[PDB]
């Protein structure tokens, strides 16, 4: 239907992520496309090993409610995710205490400073019922943190009126209850 991966990889370019949410074109069905957990991208059932042109895809990933589309101006499909459609890979730390602010890097290389307009959310794993906290990237789009990147995280981490989590760019985001933390 009936341009496919590489055809379309052809069509895109972008220097940058993709002002997306001024296009709304037709919707021109699902693609057999699905982001995994872990960041890789699936096509027909086959992985991408690929950063160039998975970077290209996700320069015009947009949220719409709850699903995920890769948006041009003329063209609109539906892709699946199974979490998020970014991973955070990388965590930097500047200054201390409470002043601190965290700037994460996704798979992808698009760098997120986590704050107020990029929050970083608490969620528990679906499967291990463990904490897997999230960062918002841009416009709904949001990274699941990486296993090295919260590791490092619990070191950085603070105890406010009952909960322990993280200070970034003057904003507090709890991400477990103290009595959590102790077990």
């Given at each position: 239907?009936?341009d ?24 021109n069905g ?31 990933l ?99 009126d009952?909960?322990f ?16 933390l102790?077990?």
């Amino acid at each position: 239907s009936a341009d496919g991966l590489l055809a379309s990889a052809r069509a895109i370019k972008s220097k940058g992520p993709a002002p997306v949410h001024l296009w709304n074109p037709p919707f021109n069905g699902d693609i057999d496309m699905r982001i995994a957990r872990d960041g890789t991208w699936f096509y027909q059932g086959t992985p991408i090993n690929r950063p160039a042109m998975v970077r290209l895809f996700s320069s015009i990933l947009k949220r719409e409610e709850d699903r995920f589309y890769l948006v041009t101006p003329v063209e609109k499909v539906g892709i699946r995710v199974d979490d998020a459609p970014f991973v955070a890979v990388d965590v930097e730390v500047a200054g201390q205490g409470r002043k601190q602010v965290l700037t994460f890097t996704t798979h992808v290389g698009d760098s997120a400073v986590a704050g107020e307009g990029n929050p970083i959310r608490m969620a528990q794993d679906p499967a291990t019922g463990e904490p897997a906290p999230y960062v918002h990237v841009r416009a709904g789009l949001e990274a699941l943190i990486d296993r090295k990147s919260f590791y490092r995280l619990m070191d950085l981490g603070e105890i406010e009126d009952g909960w322990f989590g993280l200070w970034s760019s003057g904003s507090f985001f709890p991400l477990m209850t103290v009595e959590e933390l102790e077990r």
